[PDB]
Design an enzyme around this catalytic site. Structure first.
Site, short mmCIF file in Angstrom:
data_model
loop_
_atom_site.label_atom_id
_atom_site.label_comp_id
_atom_site.label_asym_id
_atom_site.label_seq_id
_atom_site.Cartn_x
_atom_site.Cartn_y
_atom_site.Cartn_z
CB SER A 92 -0.91 -0.06 1.21
OG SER A 92 -2.14 0.56 1.39
CG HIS A 136 -5.36 -3.06 0.36
ND1 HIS A 136 -4.66 -2.71 -0.77
CD2 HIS A 136 -4.90 -2.25 1.35
CE1 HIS A 136 -3.82 -1.73 -0.49
NE2 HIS A 136 -3.95 -1.43 0.79
CG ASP A 173 -6.54 -3.81 -3.25
OD1 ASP A 173 -7.33 -3.05 -2.65
OD2 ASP A 173 -5.32 -3.85 -3.04
C1 LIG Z 1 -2.69 1.24 2.49
N1 LIG Z 1 -2.39 0.56 3.66
O1 LIG Z 1 -4.09 1.12 2.26
C2 LIG Z 1 -4.76 2.14 1.53
C3 LIG Z 1 -6.05 1.87 1.02
C4 LIG Z 1 -6.76 2.86 0.28
C5 LIG Z 1 -6.18 4.15 0.04
C6 LIG Z 1 -4.89 4.45 0.54
C7 LIG Z 1 -4.14 3.46 1.29
C8 LIG Z 1 -2.78 3.74 1.82
O2 LIG Z 1 -2.17 4.95 1.63
S1 LIG Z 1 -2.09 2.74 2.55
#
Ligand SMILES: *[C@]1(N)Oc2ccccc2C(O)S1
Ligand SMILES: *[C@]1(N)Oc2ccccc2C(O)S1
Ligand SMILES: *[C@]1(N)Oc2ccccc2C(O)S1
Ligand SMILES: *[C@]1(N)Oc2ccccc2C(O)S1
EC number: 3.1.1.-
Lengths: 257, 257, 256, 258
Positions: free
Chosen positions: C79, C236, C208
Site C-alpha cells: 500500500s 488489499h 483489492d
Molecule cells: C494502504 N495501507 O491502504 C490504503 C487503502 C486505500 C487508500 C490508501 C491506502 C494507503 O495509503 S495505505
C-alpha cells in the site's frame, strides 16, 4: 647535520595534530614524518579491525623498518603514542637517538606492559571521562573495547588552553581508538632492547587529560634519562605551545647526538 | 535570530578546512555544521565507491532531510562544494535561505550539469594542474576518474597565500576526489523552478590561482547572482588565509536582501 | 545463501501486519525484517510529529544505513509502503536487489512525487472512504492532513475477504497516518539515475477494493515494471488472506 | 441480550492479544471490549510516565466509569491483568457479574498488594526470565523498575505451544511495562468489603511456563476462588493457542454467574 623527527600521535588523533610543529622543525633544517597510525587520521582501517597494540602500531613499525642504516631518528610519542614508541624501541632500539614522551604513557621493561595504563585508570574516576565513549567490539572470551573522546572531554580535559580553532579542528577529525589494555596485560619490552634507549619526558604542567601529577609519577617510578617541562601547556602542547615544544625537541636533538 | 550555516568543503578536503571560520560564526551567535562529504575527511568510504555527484553529496542530502520543519539554513560551498550545493538546492529549495558560492563552481539550469566544469578545463591550461593526479577507476564504457592534488599544486595554486602550518595540515589530510564529469555530462540535474529559485551569492577570491578570478567572474556572468561579494587578497583557501573577512562577508549577506 | 526480506507496511498499519508472512519466509531460510515506520505499530512518535514523507520513512532509512558492506536486500512495500520504498530506492539504490510493490502506490521520476496519489484521489469518489477520518494538523503555509481508517472502511474496502480474527486485530492496532500529499506535491524524491535504476516488481491483488486492480494496472503501465505477478482472489491485505501464495510469489520473483 | 466482556491484557501486551477470542465471544451475541491499558498496545503514553498500578489501570477505570450501573460486565484478566482487575473490583464491585483470572496474578485483601508478585518471584528462579530486560527509571529516592519481555522469553516461556505466526506477532508488538512492585508494596488497594465481594473464577493453564501451574494452583489454594477452571494443553497465551476452549469456558461462567 639535519635529523629525522618521527612524530607519533595519541589516541583518537592523527598526523594532522602535528601540523603546527612540523613546519617549525623543517625550518630548522630537519626532516619530519607525522604519520597516521592504523585507523587514525585518514587511514581507511577501522578501529574494529585492530585487536592488538601491534596492529595499531603497524604503520610506525613499517616506517622504522624502512629507515636507512645510518638514518637514526628522534621518536616523539604523544599521549598513548608513548605506548606505540615502546614497540618501536623494542624492535629497532639502535635506530633511535632518543625516545621523547610528550605527556605520554611511558612503559618500561620492569613492570607489566599495561602497568602505567592500569595505574592511570585507577587514579582516574569515571566522571573525568565526561562524554567519552567506551564500547565493546570483541567477545566475552576475547574482550575488546574502543575509546572515543567526546567534544566535552576534548574541550575540558585536553584542549582547555587551546584556541577555539584548534578545538574545532580536533572535533572534526577525532576518531575512535583504544587503550588496548586487555592486549597489553598479556605481556613486550625487554631491558636489553627497549631499556637501552634513552628516554626523555616532556611534562605539560597544565595537562588535565593526563594530569601533571601522573606524569611526575611516571618520571619518579618508571624513570627517565631526562625530564623537561613546558609550563602553561595543556595536553595538546604541539597546538597551544608549538614553538616551545620545537625548541625543546631541537635541544634534545643537539644533546642526544 | 541565530542562523544555521552549513559549510561544504571542496574537492580533496573535508569539514576540517573550516576550522578557523566555524568558531568565528558561532561566536557571532550562529549554529554551524562543517560536514564531511563521502570519502572526505574522516569518512571511511573510498573514492572508488563514488560514481556520481549524488553519491559524493549523500552526507549533505542527509543533513538537509534532518532539518527541522521550520528551520532553514545558509549553504556555503567552496570550490567543488558548489556542485554539491546545486543538488541540495534542486531537491530542497525551500529549506535554503541563500546559497553562497565561495570561489566555487556554480552550475546553471540551462546546459548539462557538467557545463561549468567543462568550461573550467577548457579555459584553464593543462599545465596549471602541476602535480595533481588524474586516474581512471572505471571502465571504457562507464568511465570514472579520480582527482588528487599533489604537494606542488596545493602550495603553488591553492595555498600560496596561506601559512606554512595550514599547508602542513592540508598535506596530511588531503584525499583523492573527483569532478564526476562523466555523470554530470549525461544529465541536467538542475532546473530553474527549483535550483534557480534559490537566492545565489558569490564570493570572489581575487588572488585565486586554482580557480582564477577570471573564471569566477565568468561563472557569475553565466547565470547571474543576487549579490557578488569580493575578498581582495584571498587565495583559493579564503577560510584559512582570510577567515575574519570571510566571516564578516557571511554575516553581511546573512541579512542583505 | 538465503536473502534478507525487508517488509514495509502501508498506511495506518505496522510491522505486525506481516505476522503471517514473516514465518513462511524464514521457514524457507531467509532473513525477514518487518519494521515499524514512524508513528506506526509500537513506535512512540505521534502523527503530528511527521511533517514529511521522510520523517515517516526514517525507520526504514536507518535500517538501510545499518546494512553490511556487501549486504543486499529485497524490499516489499504494501500500500502506502510503496512510497516509503521510493525513498530507500533513491538513497541506497545499490543495496536493493528488487523493489516489490504489493498492491502499493508506485511513483515514477517523471511527474511530481505525488502524481500517483493525485490520480488515485481523483478516481476514488468520496463515498469510498466510508468512515475514514481526515483531519488537518498543519497550516496553509504547509498543509498537513492525517488519515485514519475507520472500522467500516477496513471491513468493506481492505479486509472484505479476510478472517474475522484479522479484522479484530486490525481494529485494535490501526493508527492515524497520512498520504503526505502536500509534502509530496512540492518535493523531488525520485530520480531516474537512482530510484529508477532499481528493478521493480508489482504484485497485483485482483479483489483489492482499497486500491482497485484497475489503478494498480495503471501504475504498472505508467512507469513500467520488470515483472508483474498477480495473486487472484486476494483483497488489499494479501499477506493476511493469502500469505502462502504471497510467499511463493515472493520466492519466485526472488531471482526470476 | 448478551453480556459485556471486558478483556484485560497482561504485561508488555495489549488489546491486540485478544484478537482470536474477541470474534468468538461476539459470535455468541456478546459485546466485547479489548482495551489497551496505559502505555500498552497503541496507547501513546510511555512506561516511564507510570509510577503506580493505578496510572497503568487508568483506561480500565475510565471504561468502568462509563458503565450504566444497570449494565454489568464480566471482567477477564490475563497475566498481570489480574492486578488491574482488582482495582476495578474495588471501585465498581456492583457492576461486575464475576471476575475471571486467566493464568493471572490474583491479589487478596489480607496481605500487602504486592503479595502475589512477591510470592511469584520467590518461587521463580532468576533464570526463568531469560532475555527479559529489567531497567530502572525511578529517581534515587523514588525507585521504579520497567520490565520488557525479550524474544527468547516469549518463545520459550510464554508461546512455547503457540504458532510461529503468533510469536512473530507478539515480537513486533510487545512493549515495556512494569510489575509496579514499589507502588504495590506501600499502597494498600483491595479490601474484603469491596474487592472481595466479587466472585472470582480462576482458569488454570496446565502448560504455562511463564506463571507455572504450580503457582497458579498456589494462588487458588492460598488466596481462594469461587470456582477453578482448567484448560489442559494450553501455555501462558491461552487466548492464542486455545481460543475456542477459552471462549467456551467464558460463555459458561457468563451463564451461571448472571
Ligand atoms: C494502504 N495501507 O491502504 C490504503 C487503502 C486505500 C487508500 C490508501 C491506502 C494507503 O495509503 S495505505
Ligand atoms: C591521548 N591522546 O590522550 C589521552 C587523554 C586521557 C586519557 C588517555 C589518552 C590517550 O590514550 S591518548
Ligand atoms: C576545490 N577544492 O579546489 C579546486 C581547485 C582547482 C580546480 C578544481 C578544484 C575543485 O574541484 S575543488
Ligand atoms: C503476563 N503477560 O505474563 C507474565 C509472565 C511471567 C511473569 C509475569 C508476567 C506478567 O506480569 S504479565
Amino acid at each position: 647535520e639535519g635529523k629525522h623527527f618521527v612524530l607519533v600521535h595519541g589516541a583518537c588523533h592523527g598526523g594532522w595534530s602535528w601540523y603546527k610543529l612540523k613546519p617549525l622543525l623543517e625550518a630548522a633544517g630537519h626532516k619530519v614524518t607525522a604519520l597516521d597510525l592504523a585507523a587514525s587520521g585518514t587511514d581507511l582501517r577501522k578501529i574494529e579491525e585492530l585487536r592488538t597494540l601491534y596492529d595499531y602500531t603497524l604503520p610506525l613499525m613499517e616506517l622504522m623498518e624502512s629507515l636507512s642504516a645510518d638514518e637514526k631518528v628522534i621518536l616523539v610519542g604523544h599521549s598513548l603514542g608513548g605506548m606505540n614508541l615502546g614497540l618501536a624501541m623494542e624492535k629497532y632500539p639502535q635506530k633511535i637517538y632518543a625516545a621523547v614522551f610528550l605527556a605520554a604513557f611511558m612503559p618500561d621493561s620492569v613492570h607489566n606492559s599495561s602497568f602505567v595504563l592500569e595505574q592511570y585508570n585507577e587514579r582516574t574516576p569515571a566522571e573525568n571521562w565526561l562524554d567519552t565513549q567506551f564500547l565493546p567490539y570483541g567477545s566475552p572470551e576475547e574482550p575488546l573495547t574502543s575509546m572515543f573522546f567526546g567534544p566535552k572531554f576534548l574541550a575540558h580535559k585536553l584542549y582547555q588552553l587551546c584556541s577555539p580553532e584548534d578545538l574545532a579542528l580536533a572535533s572534526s577529525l577525532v576518531r575512535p581508538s583504544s587503550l588496548f589494555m586487555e592486549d597489553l596485560s598479556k605481556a613486550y619490552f625487554t631491558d636489553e632492547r627497549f631499556g637501552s634507549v634513552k628516554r626523555v619526558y616532556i611534562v605539560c604542567t597544565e595537562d588535565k587529560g593526563i594530569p601533571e601529577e601522573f606524569q611526575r609519577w611516571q618520571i619518579d617510578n618508571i624513570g627517565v634519562t631526562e625530564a623537561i617541562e613546558i609550563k602553561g601547556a595543556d595536553h595538546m602542547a604541539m597546538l597551544c605551545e608549538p614553538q616551545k615544544l620545537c625548541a625543546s625537541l631541537l635541544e634534545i636533538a643537539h644533546k642526544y647526538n
